[model samples]
Target: ASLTEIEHLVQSVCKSYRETCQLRLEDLLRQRSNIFSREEVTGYQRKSMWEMWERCAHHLTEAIQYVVEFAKRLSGFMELCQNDQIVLLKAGAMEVVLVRMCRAYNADNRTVFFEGKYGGMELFRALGCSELISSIFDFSHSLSALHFSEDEIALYTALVLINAHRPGLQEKRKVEQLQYNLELAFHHHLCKTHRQSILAKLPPKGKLRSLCSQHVERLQIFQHLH
Candidate 1:
């Protein structure tokens, strides 16, 4: 595909993302300013911690919808059979969600947009998952340090969704073919706008997978204790 075609595809994905994503980095930054440090750090309590857990759950659930919308809007994703589609969503959506969260993350201060407010580790420390929170903050900080353009963010999310080797995929070859086009487009887009070495690494899936697995385990623990 020509660079122009790639731009169109990239633009569409970005537009879909902007429309469906509820949080914005800019908004989160502003929210951070709205709060005074007077919001006490140690105020977290048992019931409040439970409330925090549910709010985080709600946040991810909402982000997941945009993941589906963005995935379906990607050129070849909707053509996959329902089984394949579910398989991809089940396996890949959280990774995309984590990447997308970078947009709302304030890496400098190590905070994320949580429940309509910018929250730091202390705010979420009550969830009994300190290490997970730090890993997420660390992941977001490292990703933000890379300084991706909005188009790069959109493309990276697209590439993650169309990943071919996802376990249980029914039509791996077809997914691979679809993934190839996006990778070509990603390569072209990067070459045109960034240094050649910029393509040296995309977001690391091993990192995302471990973080997401930790997240899932936290959820399980929360459920069992409740």
Candidate 2:
């Protein structure tokens, strides 16, 4: 079936959200000029791990808020049962946070910045997440290579949030249908070359699930540390 005007609106909404998020992230990065500096790694290293966690937690909270508001604006998102809306946000917010923050990741150096500060592998290891951190950096590296536009990232995030298999969902069929519509809209926006490259890199099956699992595990570890 051909994509409709509403589907196109969904894409536009996603693009707007993604661009707005990118600006916010960039502004946050600028506010903390020393965040990316190598000198602060040792300074952060000297702080107790919990202190680092406290520092990082604020950014996570802010990012989560951004995602929640963005998700609520997606077409039909608010129409889902309140329970399903909560379920989708709980299931997908961490992954969306990771995606939105990918712009600040330095794949070459294997570092991730939060609130403008680079948290190298050491910080993650301190939180008992050496493996999770490694997987995230690898994922970030691959995702960055894709060079997805704001619209593409937004569409992908929307699809991730509508995952039907998420636990505690009160309306699985509705969520599934939403996912299907998003899939169609996503494809409709991709040009042949971009679609081919993305498809070749990301298989249709299990990719989001695997990434979501990784992101959730990381979130769990972070929450535990907190």
Q: Against the hidden reference, what TM-scores do the models get?
A: 0.88, 0.77
Q: What is the lDDT of residue 72 in candidate 1?
A: 80
TM-score of 1: 0.88
Q: What is the lDDT of candidate 1?
A: 0.77
Total clashes in model 1, counting residue pairs 3 or more apart in sequence or in different chains: 0
Tens digits of per-residue lDDT, candidate 1, 1-226, equal: 5668777876777776676666665676678764425344455433477787777778788889888988888878888999999988987898888887877787666776665556677777667789998898888888888887777877778888888888898899989988887888777778888644756655656888899899888778878857
Residues forming the 10-long window of minimal summed lDDT in candidate 1: 38-47
- Alpha-carbon RMSD of each model: 2.2, 3.9
Cα distance off (Å), candidate 2, residue 174: 2.6
**Winner by lDDT:** 1
Q: How well does candidate 1 score on lDDT at residue 116? A: 56
List model 2 lDDT by residue over 1-226, tens digit each.
3547746666567765865473555554454444445555555567775776666677778888888988887877888988999988986887787777676666555666654466667655445556666766776777877776677778878877778988888789988887888877777677532564585665343554576686577677767745
Q: What is the lDDT of residue 161 in candidate 2?
A: 79
